[PDB]
């Protein structure tokens, strides 16, 4: 893959790595057998910290800043929730000690969120787990989630499209390289993009079926 594509990848990878380590996140939940209603406070905080690092990550995307300064707001709050689930999936499937993996699962299930919404998540996490994705594939796919031209209130759709294109070509090539075992791994991936839209759709309804930080009220449209 071209030295211009190859150097673009590195800025994404550098930017992506400013995230909290999976171990940090993992640690915060499985440490102390929490109150069901304090798990909410913890999860709230994580998502708030995710949004903050996510905003920073989007700023440095080539060239996100050339876009309309109200289409950036559309892009962000149109992808924030989807970005989160992808990152959770990344975290959940990172290898853990004996018994810690299942303990995490059941602690999330014991958070007041309904099994209606919880069973679909762990099935989606189990789903991307079996794709045995690399860190690079994760971050390029997150970037493709953010620069999705079909979000709401996007005044200039064609601008976003042409920003998204480059990333798809890299992700295609990377898929060939890291996984020539699975010849349709690239497509399998874009498949997951679809499934992430159901999380976007239901998120509002999930939270209201059982507070929030200022940044979360805003980017999730909740109270």
């Amino acid at each position: 893959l071209t030295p211009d594509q190859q150097t673009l990848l590195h800025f994404i990878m550098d930017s992506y790595n400013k995230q909290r380590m999976p171990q940090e996140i993992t640690n915060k939940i499985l440490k102390e057998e929490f109150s069901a209603e304090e798990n909410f406070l913890i999860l709230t905080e994580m998502a708030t910290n995710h949004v903050q690092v996510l905003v920073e990550f989007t700023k440095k995307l080539p060239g996100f800043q050339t876009l309309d300064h109200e289409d950036q707001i559309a892009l962000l709050k149109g992808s924030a929730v989807e970005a989160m689930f992808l990152r959770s999936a990344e975290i959940f499937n990172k290898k853990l000690p004996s018994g810690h993996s299942d303990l995490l699962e059941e602690r999330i299930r014991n958070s007041g969120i309904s099994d209606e919404y919880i069973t679909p998540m762990f099935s989606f996490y189990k789903s991307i787990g079996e794709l045995k994705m690399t860190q690079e594939e994760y971050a390029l796919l997150t970037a493709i989630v953010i620069l999705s031209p079909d979000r709401q209130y996007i005044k200039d759709r064609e601008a976003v499209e042409k920003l998204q294109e480059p990333l798809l070509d890299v992700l295609q090539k990377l898929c060939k390289i890291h996984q020539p075992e699975n010849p349709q791994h690239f497509a399998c991936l874009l498949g997951r993009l679809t499934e992430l839209r159901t999380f976007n759709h239901h998120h509002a309804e999930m939270l209201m079926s059982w507070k929030f930080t200022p940044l979360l009220c805003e980017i999730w449209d909740v109270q």
Partner: peptide, 6 residues
């Protein structure tokens, strides 16, 4: 919006 808009 407010926070988010910088």
């Amino acid at each position: 919006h407010k926070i988010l808009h910088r």
